[PDB]
Structure 1
Amino acid sequence: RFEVKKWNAVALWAWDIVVDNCAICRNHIMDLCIECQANQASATSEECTVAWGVCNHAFHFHCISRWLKTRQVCPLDNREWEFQKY
């Protein structure tokens, strides 16, 4: 017989706008990019990771990097984009 006197829990919150998938490319966030998976493997595919912003949105690094060449605005919210995690 064991009883739980108290519990201290830690949780992380993220946006539910997308269900565990990138927004620019509609694939799993933990998988490869569309360009990376369509093209042959190389040194570029090694650095394929997920990127977070101040607005707490998660995209593939390649996807957001390609998006930022022409526009300077986060795809989901119209605020300016700023990298904060890799």
Structure 2
Amino acid sequence: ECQANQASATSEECTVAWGVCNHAFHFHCISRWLKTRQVCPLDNREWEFQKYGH
């Protein structure tokens, strides 16, 4: 959603997203995944947001 979708990419971020279960994803990717499902598709945990960035 940042190399194929947006072209300007100005004043942008696309950080990492760390959860309680210690998994890591792009902030953009997990936030969009939270639209339909909210269960951290690697497990059935509810995926609390414990950190952003590396």
Q: Write the deviation string for residues 27-77 of structure 1: whole angstroms up to 9, x where unpaired.
A: xxxxxxxx2101343357722110100000000011100100111101101
Identity %: 100
- Aligned-pair Cα RMSD in Å: 1.9
Structure 2 stretches of 5 or more lacking a match?
none
Moved >4 Å (runs of 4+):
none
Q: Considering fraction of residues, name the structure with more helix.
A: 1
Provide structure 1 residue ranges, at least 5 long, that are not aligned to the other structure. 1-34
Q: Answer with 1 or 2: which has the greater Rg.
A: 1
**Higher RCO (C-alpha under 8 Å, 6+ residues apart):** 2
Give TM-score, length-normalised by structure 1: 0.53
Matched pairs, number: 52
